């Protein structure tokens, strides 16, 4: 029979990162625009 | 028979990150725009 | 029978990076534009 | 006679756009920053 | 007589665009930074 | 008589574009930086 | 004797700027993102 | 004796700028992204 | 005795600029990305 267009394209994400493990916390500047595991 | 378009595209997310483990808490600047595991 | 166009192109991502493991936290400059595991 | 500076610069706007006419409503991502007919 | 500076420079805008007329609505990514008919 | 500088330079804009007329809506990537009819 | 890490990095700011001294107030556009003497 | 790492890197700022001293205020466009004396 | 690493690198800034001293304020375009005395 007639088969119309089927919607799809499911997203799936799973990261695993380490940030600032062993480090002093002196007067650090301003860090930004930082992002991971995804878009926008 | 006639089959109309079926809606789909389910999202699924699951991260695991480490932030500031062992570090002093001196006068740190302003960190922002920080985001992970998702969009926007 | 007639087969219309089927929608597809599902995305899937999974990284694993290490950032700033063993390092002092002196007056570091401003780091930005940093991103991984994805687009935009 | 003496003529001081006259204030002016009146704004006027009038658009006409079509957004999402005939389209399924599956799991669409997040659209933003979208704006028209004006500033800011 | 003496004629001081007259203020002016009136803005006027009027577009007409078509966005997403006939298209399925599958799992579309995130569209942004989209703008027309104006500044900023 | 004395004629001081007169302010001017009025802007005027009017485009007409077609975007995504007849096209499927599969898993499209992320489109950005898109802009027309103006500056910035 | 043993001397643990001492917290420090005190901030201090003091500017002095002039904005819009002698100027008419016609239909000025929208100015934003304007900031000084500090971060964020 | 044993001397552990001392936290430091104090910030200090002090500018002095002139903006728009003697100028008419006609229909000026939209100025933005302007900043000084600091980061971000 | 044992001397661990000492945190340092204090920032200090002090500019002095003149912007738009004597100039008419006609329909000026949109100026941006303007910044001085600092980073980012």
UniProtKB/Swiss-Prot annotation, chains A, B, C, D, E, F, G, H, I:
Changing residue 13 to R: Only 23% zinc-induced amyloid-beta protein 28 aggregation. Residues 24-40 are annotated as: Interaction with PSEN1. It is found in: Cell surface. Cu(2+) 2 binds at residues 6, 10, 13-14. Glycans are attached at residue 10. Changing residue 35 to V: No free radical production. No hippocampal neuron toxicity. Changing residue 21 to G: In AD1; Flemish mutation; increases the solubility of processed amyloid-beta peptides and increases the stability of peptide oligomers. The record marks 33 as: Implicated in free radical propagation. Changing residue 24 to C: Causes formation of an artifactual disulfide bond with PSEN1. Zn(2+) 2 binds at residues 6, 10, 13-14. Changing residue 22 to K: In CAA-APP; Italian type. The record marks 1-2, 7-8, 16-17, 19-20 as: Cleavage. The record marks 35 as: Susceptible to oxidation. Changing residue 5 to G: 60-70% zinc-induced amyloid-beta protein 28 aggregation. Interacts with S100A9. This is Amyloid-beta protein 40. It comes from Homo sapiens (Human). The chain holds residues 672 to 711 of 770 of the full protein.
